[PDB]
Amino acid sequence: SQNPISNNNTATLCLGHHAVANGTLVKTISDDQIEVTNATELVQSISMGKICNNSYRILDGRNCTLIDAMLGDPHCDVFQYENWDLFIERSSAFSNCYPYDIPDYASLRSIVASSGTLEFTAEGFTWTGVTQNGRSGACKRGSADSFFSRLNWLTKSGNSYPTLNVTMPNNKNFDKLYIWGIHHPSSNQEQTKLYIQESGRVTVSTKRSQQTIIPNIGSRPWVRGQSGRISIYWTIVKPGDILMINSNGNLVAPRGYFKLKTGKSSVMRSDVPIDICVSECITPNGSISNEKPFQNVNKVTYGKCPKYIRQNTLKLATGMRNVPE
Amino acid sequence: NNNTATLCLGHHAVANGTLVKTISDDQIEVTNATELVQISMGKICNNSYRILDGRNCTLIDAMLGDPHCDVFQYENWDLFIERSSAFSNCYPYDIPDYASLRSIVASSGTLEFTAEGFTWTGVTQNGRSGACKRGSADSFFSRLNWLTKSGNSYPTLNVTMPNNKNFDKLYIWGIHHPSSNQEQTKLYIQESGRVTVSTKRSQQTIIPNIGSRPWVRGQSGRISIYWTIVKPGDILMINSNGNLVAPRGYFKLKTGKSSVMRSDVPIDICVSECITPNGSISNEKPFQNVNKVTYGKCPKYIRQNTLKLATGMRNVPEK
Amino acid sequence: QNPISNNNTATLCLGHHAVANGTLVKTISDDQIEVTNATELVQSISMGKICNNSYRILDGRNCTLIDAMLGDPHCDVFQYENWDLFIERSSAFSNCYPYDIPDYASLRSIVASSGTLEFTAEGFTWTGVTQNGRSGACKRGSADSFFSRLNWLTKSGNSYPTLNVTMPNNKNFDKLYIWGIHHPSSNQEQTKLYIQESGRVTVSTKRSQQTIIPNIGSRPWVRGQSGRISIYWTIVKPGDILMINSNGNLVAPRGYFKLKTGKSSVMRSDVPIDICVSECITPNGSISNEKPFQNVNKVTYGKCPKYIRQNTLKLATGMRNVPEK
Amino acid sequence: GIFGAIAGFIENGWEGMVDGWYGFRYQNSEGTGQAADLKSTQTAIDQINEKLNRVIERTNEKFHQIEKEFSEVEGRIQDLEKYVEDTKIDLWSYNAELLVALENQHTIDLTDAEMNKLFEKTRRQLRENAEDMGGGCFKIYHKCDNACIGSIRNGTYDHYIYRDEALNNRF
Amino acid sequence: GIFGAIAGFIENGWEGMVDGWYGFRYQNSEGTGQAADLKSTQTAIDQINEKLNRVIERTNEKFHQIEKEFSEVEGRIQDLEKYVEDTKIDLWSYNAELLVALENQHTIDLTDAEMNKLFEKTRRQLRENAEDMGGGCFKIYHKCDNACIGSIRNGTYDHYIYRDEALNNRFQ
Amino acid sequence: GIFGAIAGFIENGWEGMVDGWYGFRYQNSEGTGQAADLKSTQTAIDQINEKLNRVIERTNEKFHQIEKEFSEVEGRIQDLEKYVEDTKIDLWSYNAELLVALENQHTIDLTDAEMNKLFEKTRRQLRENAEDMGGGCFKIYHKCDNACIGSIRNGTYDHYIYRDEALNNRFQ
Ligand SMILES: *[C@@H]1O[C@H](CO)[C@@H](O[C@@H]2O[C@H](CO)[C@@H](O[C@@H]3O[C@H](CO[C@H]4O[C@H](CO)[C@@H](O)[C@H](O)[C@@H]4O)[C@@H](O)[C@H](O[C@H]4O[C@H](CO)[C@@H](O)[C@H](O)[C@@H]4O)[C@@H]3O)[C@H](O)[C@H]2NC(C)=O)[C@H](O)[C@H]1NC(C)=O
Ligand SMILES: *[C@@H]1O[C@H](CO)[C@@H](O[C@@H]2O[C@H](CO)[C@@H](O[C@@H]3O[C@H](CO[C@H]4O[C@H](CO)[C@@H](O)[C@H](O)[C@@H]4O)[C@@H](O)[C@H](O[C@H]4O[C@H](CO)[C@@H](O)[C@H](O)[C@@H]4O)[C@@H]3O)[C@H](O)[C@H]2NC(C)=O)[C@H](O)[C@H]1NC(C)=O
Ligand SMILES: *[C@@H]1O[C@H](CO)[C@@H](O[C@@H]2O[C@H](CO)[C@@H](O[C@@H]3O[C@H](CO[C@H]4O[C@H](CO)[C@@H](O)[C@H](O)[C@@H]4O)[C@@H](O)[C@H](O[C@H]4O[C@H](CO)[C@@H](O)[C@H](O)[C@@H]4O)[C@@H]3O)[C@H](O)[C@H]2NC(C)=O)[C@H](O)[C@H]1NC(C)=O
Ligand SMILES: *[C@@H]1O[C@H](CO[C@H]2O[C@@H](C)[C@@H](O)[C@@H](O)[C@@H]2O)[C@@H](O[C@@H]2O[C@H](CO)[C@@H](O[C@@H]3O[C@H](CO)[C@@H](O)[C@H](O)[C@@H]3O)[C@H](O)[C@H]2NC(C)=O)[C@H](O)[C@H]1NC(C)=O
Ligand SMILES: CC(=O)N[C@@H]1[C@@H](O)[C@H](O[C@@H]2O[C@H](CO)[C@H](O)[C@H](O[C@]3(C(=O)O)C[C@H](O)[C@@H](NC(C)=O)[C@H]([C@H](O)[C@H](O)CO)O3)[C@H]2O)[C@@H](CO)O[C@H]1O
Ligand SMILES: CC(=O)N[C@@H]1[C@@H](O)[C@H](O[C@@H]2O[C@H](CO)[C@H](O)[C@H](O[C@]3(C(=O)O)C[C@H](O)[C@@H](NC(C)=O)[C@H]([C@H](O)[C@H](O)CO)O3)[C@H]2O)[C@@H](CO)O[C@H]1O
Ligand SMILES: *[C@@H]1O[C@H](CO)[C@@H](O[C@@H]2O[C@H](CO)[C@@H](O[C@@H]3O[C@H](CO)[C@@H](O)[C@H](O)[C@@H]3O)[C@H](O)[C@H]2NC(C)=O)[C@H](O)[C@H]1NC(C)=O
Ligand SMILES: *[C@@H]1O[C@H](CO[C@H]2O[C@@H](C)[C@@H](O)[C@@H](O)[C@@H]2O)[C@@H](O[C@@H]2O[C@H](CO)[C@@H](O)[C@H](O)[C@H]2NC(C)=O)[C@H](O)[C@H]1NC(C)=O
Ligand SMILES: *[C@@H]1O[C@H](CO)[C@@H](O[C@@H]2O[C@H](CO)[C@@H](O)[C@H](O)[C@H]2NC(C)=O)[C@H](O)[C@H]1NC(C)=O
Ligand SMILES: *[C@@H]1O[C@H](CO)[C@@H](O[C@@H]2O[C@H](CO)[C@@H](O)[C@H](O)[C@H]2NC(C)=O)[C@H](O)[C@H]1NC(C)=O
Ligand SMILES: *[C@@H]1O[C@H](CO[C@H]2O[C@@H](C)[C@@H](O)[C@@H](O)[C@@H]2O)[C@@H](O)[C@H](O)[C@H]1NC(C)=O
Ligand SMILES: *[C@@H]1O[C@H](CO)[C@@H](O)[C@H](O)[C@H]1NC(C)=O
Ligand SMILES: *[C@@H]1O[C@H](CO)[C@@H](O)[C@H](O)[C@H]1NC(C)=O
Ligand SMILES: *[C@@H]1O[C@H](CO)[C@@H](O)[C@H](O)[C@H]1NC(C)=O
Ligand SMILES: *[C@@H]1O[C@H](CO)[C@@H](O)[C@H](O)[C@H]1NC(C)=O
């Protein structure tokens, strides 16, 4: 101009944008890094370190698995008639009953957890010519030898084990789930002395499905006083369908059925403790905040959760580019 | 005024606009838009693709030769329509890996059957049951052959059947499961059965199971079905001393582009190149919210029932 | 209006660069549009041969992974081998006793991912039975033989006593035992080799078990044999134990294979292997891993571009091209 | 609009105009009039017309796939089959939601750009014979009949002819 | 910026301005001053406020899924379970990365535009009474009290009233 | 493009300009000349060079995967393995298609804007000493040698010293 004192009859009018002192770097299509006024984190990296029980109905398995609790293990009798949204399995859990294996244990674990209930109902299975309630020292309940509370170990009555045959029609409007099994003796003498016949057989069958499993007499590892085993199976009887159980030996009979539902429940393996709080997302690392759209805590989740990603941080700009003075 | 002139620029706009969504805004009005998510015709169009209506038969019953599914003999298709009111009306049966077979047959897209000269020495053929009535009389699956004793003898059957063709053969056989020991020693003489169907590259052996099953169309016995594929230059062999539900021939398998679908809607003449359980749908749009189960030139299924694309500028009506 | 540019005037024009020979790309606005430059993002061409100077490639030649594992006479050169990628040729074949493997693919995957055929012998005591049984269908050198890793057990004198042995895992890694059962051609051949009519094999750990019954019947001759064998495997973890009970038909193991959580695999190809530099491999030879996408094969191994359906994608590395005149 | 033309300095759109997306209105010695600009209109239509075919391909054939509905309860294998499809649906549902918003965002901006460019084109032509009145209107400071307007529309306006007339009335 | 306003012909922003994103700083006879522009500020906030909701819906509710962690090595069915999960993670990881890049790219584009929009909006009102000096500032060639600044701010600037005084001061 | 610079108000490009992307052409008493601009060029190259690295991960290693080729018919297990791979490929094929279309669109817009930004930068320097001819050209209305031209190109052109000379040329 220069005129150190500006004139009365003219004016100046400048335009501009705001700014902050300490900005933050984001990534765009154009730039690798670029400073903005404020940004926000989209990836939940921090867990709460515990499971919140006030949102969804949680159930702690303690030292019992979902299958042990279902089967009816002596030290899992507290779990009778329980329903849940999320069952929790601990790493230190175990079995202290008769040693067993379940062909396709994973599929059975999936079906029970999804239904989300252990609602058992006993039924009047009329067994003819056999001794009910078999007991074992490997499975102790109280001050006596016992067995799985939802299973029935059938053995010979006198000097004869006749061919069993029983009916049980499903007259309800829901799916019944029967859990049954078969025994595997350690020697030929056990087989012959226990169930008379040299070879047992268990033909469970409906109008459409059938299952026949033959025993296999042989030595297995010593497990709580037993070198024998018991295999477990299941058959889902549909509304109107009829259950039939034919066997001439080695039958571990079912006492009743489980009520199956198209549930919205599940099971999870986690070792963190459960505590009083509110959270709608649950991972093996505890519950997490479900406000962020993504998370880097765990791929395994249950409930209203954000989507898992390999990135640990994604800054979304919530403001303009910052240009300090 | 004559000394000056005014020239104004602008753009067009309409009375009734339409709302669309962008990255900037939730709902912003534009001059014209269009829908990108596909309603069904309520019927499966059988002009473009070859459609086959099962009516009261499944693909397996039509294959095995169930009395009320003999209309489906020597049929080929692009899409086999199974009705929910389907049923079996022959001998009660089960099949290990039922769904796996259903897919292989549906994928092939044909029930071409060719009877082969099987010699069965010393056994009664063409066994029949009252559970499987063909013309108000006892009968059996038309593609299977129930063999039993002849006289007081059931000899160890042993037959062979080479593949001297240039394609994969599909054999459908089974094994009878009797209800009691009396049926076993009456029908098959022996106390226990055995069936060994094998090739140079595989083998399947099955023992029967003497046990009572639920009452189905008169019988408490069962039959288990098992399939076996024979490649070009390979050879089939069937050894058995009891309970063999023998095959009469083979089905031709080919890498078709066919499939099977469950549906309960009418089928009639119309023009469409996508098919769902709800019916045929128009494939003009890129997406659809009718059914995830599809077949043909079909739009992609998504969760959303509406996605409005803008085909015009922003709408700014006059005051 | 004056033709000559006055000394009190000047012209200044702004412009962009151009090129005579442009290239086409696709934008959101245009299907084709001419740009000053472009680059390809789809590697559609392979080198035509597999490289072995980055990853260790092992040519399988006439043997498959399983035929090299079991000890097929013409695969004896593959003993105590290790790899990052095993190449199985289509012209490969088996030349020993005819066999099958229930879930053949699953075993193939486990060993290929392990990435090693490191074998270790163990002292199994098969009291009261013959060993080292061999067939005419498996000619090692110019004499009868059998799979080197398997041991065929038959009767001694006139008895096949109930075999029962155990082998604990006191190491610090997983043991993989390859074992099997033999299927005769008839009842006559059954009692001839193994005395007892009903053969049986029970292989059991403390928590799992696999019981197999033989299969009898005439089958097509493969190298002069109507008899067959089925192969099974058993994983024994650190701390667990192995036990094998059987009264016939046992094709016993001689030792264990070492298991690893490796980064190895197996590939089907008929392309030669030679010296070159590449970190990506397909069934069509190695591929250059500079471009982000590729269009050679969906099966890939190593540091590879993502397979897509498109054979060409042009990215613009330059502005809109507008030639002169 | 990011250029700030549509719903910006131009107050509103014209319903009266039919044969074009953009155009001119004017008044002069020979009364009022209206016109439409084809060149700018066509650029808008070309970009918009069938703009998904440069992203989503022509719908291809799909034959036998896998089971998506199940009457029975089977366990492990069924859970995977349901999970595989559930994963497919969400990823496509996202891509669809994403695409449409991007495509719409672009369609708003390209039309907003065309309006701005048409205004700049005219401004450059008039040079210093006219002035921005606001509302996308130009005040021309010389006698401009319909024949002179036409020259502005088709891009043949020579400002030097009306230089001395304009700059006199201007200042 | 692509319009070249922010980090362009505007040398820098102001830390002093705290009651808005865009505004005016002016100097005249009555003194200096400042005033934010609420219309341009709010337009930028409206768009940026929750701009992930227009593509990703808050969060989906999910229950029983497949097993993503295993203890035993099994083979085929296990390999498929692993492969399915990685492909999902890989595809979502890509979607998240691409999303933020475009969102961030767009966030800078719109704010840059707003600064440029307000600049042109001001220039149009001023007509021939002022000149763009450079640095995003205008020299107004007439007396302009705070009442006259408000008239520019609230859109009611009447350039014809000052035109005689303005033009005369420019050409001398 | 959207700014209407490249293939818009500027008629065509220069094949002769090889030392840069953007530049100048001038004419005065001392003849004609052509000079590139390094600032606009560098800004464009930094945005385009390895632009896919900002969205795509550094290609990582994949080891043992599922089987994607089968010589037999197996059914339910095989159909799923084929379906998983088909579903995967179609999604990456789409992601690749959409990415390239967006990045190409971004390239055309950013380059078109850098053209427009250099023009508007020069217009603000010249103030009222020059007029826009159209065709992206400027008519400077005063004595302007190569030393004066040079001051515009590096950004130190003081219009004030020429102003009085230019205003008399423009309106008389
Ligand atoms: C097939 O072959 C196998 C292997 O030879 C046999 O399996 C073994 O059978 C024997 C006899 O039953 C088992 O012997 C038992 O071992 C127990 C081990 O338990 C723990 O306790 C000891 C310390 O006491 C620890 O050192 C050890 O590590 C274990 O953690 C012992 O407890 C038993 O010893 C005695 O215990 C009580 C103490 O009150 C005494 O009263 C009894 O007399 C008892 O003998 C016992 O010796 C052995 O464990 C089995 N091994 C395996 C791997 O299972 C099969 O029996 C064989 N089958 C046939 C049909 O021949
Ligand atoms: C193992 O245990 C099971 C179950 O106890 C036994 O199986 C039953 O066996 C009996 C005798 O063979 C079967 O009896 C038959 O029942 C049929 C019922 O089905 C119908 O009922 C509904 C009514 O709700 C009708 O709508 C429908 O149309 C059917 O009619 C009857 O149809 C049969 O009728 C015949 O029986 C009478 C007997 O007085 C005869 O005089 C006539 O010929 C008449 O036609 C018949 O009563 C029964 O179905 C079997 N049930 C099941 C579930 O299998 C096994 O026998 C047993 N196994 C062994 C080895 O003992
Ligand atoms: C159930 O039915 C099956 C199939 O019919 C029987 O299996 C066959 O059994 C016979 C008898 O053991 C086998 O016969 C042998 O075939 C060998 C194969 O080599 C070639 O032979 C054929 C001849 O037509 C050629 O065309 C072709 O090149 C073959 O490669 C031959 O090597 C043998 O030939 C010789 O036989 C005698 C001994 O009998 C020797 O002394 C001679 O020197 C000569 O070399 C022999 O003929 C036949 O291979 C089996 N086929 C299959 C597919 O398994 C079962 O035996 C039967 N089961 C029961 C219980 O009856
Ligand atoms: C318009 O300009 C032309 C050429 O541009 C020159 O302008 C001069 C003023 C100066 O700025 C120079 O840098 C520019 O290139 C003028 O042509 C010039 O005329 C003068 C006078 O004749 C020459 O200067 C001297 O003349 C004699 C030559 O015998 C000698 O004493 C000196 O060495 C010197 O040359 C000059 O060289 C001319 N340049 C050219 C290229 O011909 C022109 O005069 C001017 N027009 C008007 C009306 O002033
Ligand atoms: C040191 C010694 O020699 N001791 C034996 C002692 O083992 C034996 O007792 C029986 O031994 C048998 C052989 O295996 C079983 O172990 C018996 O175990 C029980 C059990 O504890 O579970 C008893 C139980 O009553 C049985 N269950 C039922 C329903 O009957 C089971 C059952 O037999 C097995 O599950 C079959 O596999 O086993 C154990 O009592 C005695 C008997 O004479 O002799 C000592 O010398
Ligand atoms: C329980 C009783 O006393 N029932 C009698 C009985 O005389 C008869 O019922 C017969 O019971 C047998 C049991 O082995 C079969 O169920 C008979 O069914 C038939 C059939 O399908 O109709 C007869 C047929 O000839 C048989 N076919 C062949 C090839 O053998 C089949 C076949 O044995 C079974 O399907 C095998 O599972 O069974 C049935 O007639 C009835 C009628 O006379 O009268 C009762 O009083
Ligand atoms: C326009 O883009 C093209 C390709 O998109 C550029 O071509 C590239 O030119 C460079 C040299 O500038 C060449 O470099 C060579 O690279 C290969 C492979 O890395 C190497 O073997 C050679 O030793 C050399 O370094 C290269 O051939 C070529 N790119 C490709 C993929 O072939 C061109 O330079 C660009 N030009 C302009 C003006 O933008
Ligand atoms: C736009 O504002 C002007 C005046 O400027 C006002 O700016 C405000 C931010 C605030 O500081 C206020 O004090 C300041 O006056 C308004 O015009 C004036 O309105 C007054 C009302 O009393 C009249 O007395 C004046 O004559 C009148 N003159 C002028 C030259 O502006 C104007 O009303 C307002 N318009 C709108 C739409 O809000
Ligand atoms: C800048 O943005 C941050 C978030 O990026 C804001 O602070 C968060 O506000 C939310 C919602 O009110 C709260 O959950 C927390 O208090 C804050 N979280 C974090 C991680 O900071 C806030 O709007 C701005 N913060 C500052 C300092 O400018
Ligand atoms: C890459 O390798 C695959 C084999 O894994 C090739 O697939 C074959 O391609 C030929 C020629 O196109 C066809 O005739 C065959 O039918 C294909 N498959 C098989 C199983 O044979 C593929 O073509 C190869 N790519 C090349 C050579 O460019
Ligand atoms: C800016 O340029 C000023 C004058 O222009 C010169 O530009 C160069 C092209 C130079 O080599 C000479 O030929 C021109 O005369 C010069 O005075 C300044 O030094 C330059 N300043 C900066 C910061 O670059
Ligand atoms: C910015 O960060 C610096 C780091 O030293 C710190 O001193 C201060 O809290 C911050 N300054 C402002 C003005 O917010
Ligand atoms: C989360 O849990 C997993 C097991 O599911 C565990 O391996 C991992 O260490 C945990 N992550 C933490 C605590 O950050
Ligand atoms: C690599 O391949 C070459 C050529 O086949 C072979 O000679 C060599 O043994 C292989 N291995 C190494 C480590 O070079
Ligand atoms: C353009 O329009 C003007 C207006 O009258 C007319 O003179 C002329 O014919 C037209 N020129 C061209 C080249 O179209």
**Mind listing the domains of chain E with CATH numbers?**
1-172 (3.90.20.10)
A99 lines ligand 5 (CB under 6 A): no
Q: Determine the Cα–Cα distance for residues B78 and D16; give it in Å rounded to an integer.
A: 55
State the helix-helix crossing angle for F76-126 and F146-154, rounded to 10 degrees.
Answer: 140
In chain C, what is the straight-line distance between the N-terminal and C-terminal CA atoms, in Å?
Answer: 25
> DSSP letter at B70?
G
Phi, psi at E89, each rounded to 5°: -60, -45
Q: Which of A51, A287, A298 to mutate to test the pocket of ligand 13 (most atoms within 8 A of CB)?
A: A298
Type of residue numbered D108: I
CA distance C263 to chain F (A): 6
Per-residue burial over F117-152, b = 16 or more CB atoms within 10 Å of its CB, e = otherwise: bbbbbbebbbbebbbbebebbbbbbbbbeeebbeeb
In the structure encoding, which two tokens stand for residue F114, read together?
């850098």
Tell me the C-alpha to C-alpha distance, in Å, between residue C150 and each of C66, C79, C160, E85: 13, 14, 18, 37
3-state secondary structure of C60: coil
Residue C313 touches chain F, beta carbons under 8 Å? yes
Q: Determine the Cα–Cα distance for residues F27 and F33; give it in Å rounded to an integer.
A: 7
Q: Determine the Cα–Cα distance for residues A203 and A61; give it in Å rounded to an integer.
A: 33
Asked if B213's CB is within 8 angstroms of A244's CB, the reply is: yes
Contacts 24+ apart (CB under 8 A), D53-58: D53/C31, D54/C26, D54/C27, D54/C28, D54/C30, D54/C31, D54/F101, D55/C28, D55/D99, D55/D103, D55/F94, D55/F97, D55/F98, D55/F101, D56/B286, D56/D99, D56/F94, D57/F97
Nearest CA in chain F to A32: F54
Calculate the CA dihedral of residues B250, B255, B256, B262 and round it to 10 degrees: 70
In the structure encoding, which two tokens stand for residue C159, read together?
């008895």
Residue A114's H or E segment, with its range, is helix A105-115
Residue D64 touches chain C, beta carbons under 8 Å? no
Nearest CA in chain D to B80: D64
**In degrees, to the nearest 5, what angle opens at C-alpha C180 toward C-alphas C179 and C184?**
160
C283 lines ligand 10 (CB under 6 A): yes
Contact (Cβ atoms closer than 8 angstroms) between residue B241 and residue B187: no
Ligand nearest to the CA of C61: 14
DSSP per-residue codes, A171-205:
-SSSEEEEEEEEEE-SSHHHHHHHHSSSS-EEEEE
Contact (Cβ atoms closer than 8 angstroms) between residue B295 and residue B274: yes
Q: Which residues of A touch C315 (CB under 8 A)?
A: none
Q: Of A107, A175, A260, which is closest to D74 when you measure between CB atoms?
A: A107
Q: Tell whether the torsion through CA atoms of B57, B60, B66 and B70 is positive or negative.
A: positive
Q: Determine the Cα–Cα distance for residues F68 and C297; give it in Å rounded to an integer.
A: 10
Contacts 24+ apart (CB under 8 A), C165-168: C165/C124, C165/C125, C165/C126, C165/C243, C165/C244, C166/A221, C166/C241, C166/C242, C166/C243, C166/C244, C167/C122, C167/C124, C167/C236, C167/C241, C167/C242, C167/C243, C168/C240, C168/C241, C168/C242
Q: Tell whether the torsion through CA atoms of A312, A317, A318 and A324 is positive or negative.
A: positive
Question: In angstroms, what is the span from residue E164 Cα to ligand 8's centroid?
Answer: 22
Contact (Cβ atoms closer than 8 angstroms) between residue A39 and residue A321: no
Question: In angstroms, what is the span from residue A230 Cα to ligand 1's centroid?
Answer: 20
Residue B282 touches chain C, beta carbons under 8 Å? no
Mutate to test the interface with E, among A14, A279, A283, A291 (most CBs of E within 10 A): A14
DSSP per-residue codes, C229-264:
EEEEEEEE-TT-EEEEEEEE-EEEESEEEE------
The reported resolution of this PDB entry, expressed in Å, is: 3.0
In chain A, what is the straight-line distance between the N-terminal and C-terminal CA atoms, in Å?
Answer: 24
Phi, psi at F60, each rounded to 5°: -100, 170
Contact (Cβ atoms closer than 8 angstroms) between residue B267 and residue B247: no
Q: Determine the Cα–Cα distance for residues E113 and E111; give it in Å rounded to an integer.
A: 5
- Beta-carbon count within 10 A of A313 CB: 10
State the helix-helix crossing angle for D76-126 and D38-48, rounded to 10 degrees.
Answer: 170
What percentage of chain D's residues is helix, strand, coil (to nearest 5)?
50, 15, 40
Residue A71's H or E segment, with its range, is helix A66-71
Parent domain of A222: 57-272
Beta bridge partners of A275: A52
In the structure encoding, which two tokens stand for residue A323, read together?
């240009």
Phi, psi at C103, each rounded to 5°: 65, 55
Q: Determine the Cα–Cα distance for residues B172 and B197; give it in Å rounded to an integer.
A: 11
Q: Determine the Cα–Cα distance for residues F165 and B317; give it in Å rounded to an integer.
A: 49
Per-residue burial over E46-82, b = 16 or more CB atoms within 10 Å of its CB, e = otherwise: ebbeebbebbbeebeebbbbbbbeeeebbbbebbbbe
Phi, psi at A190, each rounded to 5°: -60, -50
Q: Tell whether the torsion through CA atoms of A99, A101, A102 and A106 is positive or negative.
A: positive
Instruction: Kindly report the protein residue whose alpha carbon is nearest to atom 5 of ligand 13.
Output: A284
Q: Tokens 């009395």 — which residue?
A: B67
Instruction: Kindly report the protein residue whose alpha carbon is nearest to atom 5 of ligand 11.
Output: F150
Q: Tokens 């003489």 — which residue?
A: B189
Q: Tokens 């087989």 — which residue?
A: A191
Q: Determine the Cα–Cα distance for residues B279 and B291; give it in Å rounded to an integer.
A: 10
Contact (Cβ atoms closer than 8 angstroms) between residue C324 and residue C89: no
- Beta-carbon count within 10 A of A136 CB: 18
Q: Tokens 């019953």 — which residue?
A: B61
Tell me the C-alpha to C-alpha distance, in Å, between residue A111 and each of A65, A100, A263, C39, F139: 14, 19, 10, 53, 82
Q: Which chains touch D (3 or more CB pairs under 8 A)?
A: A, B, C, E, F
Q: Determine the Cα–Cα distance for residues D88 and D37; give it in Å rounded to an integer.
A: 46
> DSSP letter at B60?
H
CA distance C185 to chain B (A): 10
Question: In angstroms, what is the span from residue F53 Cα to ligand 7's centroid?
Answer: 18
CATH number at residue C73: 3.90.209.20
DSSP per-residue codes, F86-152:
HHHHHHHHHHHHHHHHHHHHHHHHHHHHHHHHHHHHHHHHHTTSEEEEETTEEEE-S---HHHHHHH
CA distance A213 to chain D (A): 19
Residue D9 touches chain E, beta carbons under 8 Å? yes
In the structure encoding, which two tokens stand for residue E105, read together?
């790219």
State the helix-helix crossing angle for D76-126 and A105-115, rounded to 10 degrees.
Answer: 70
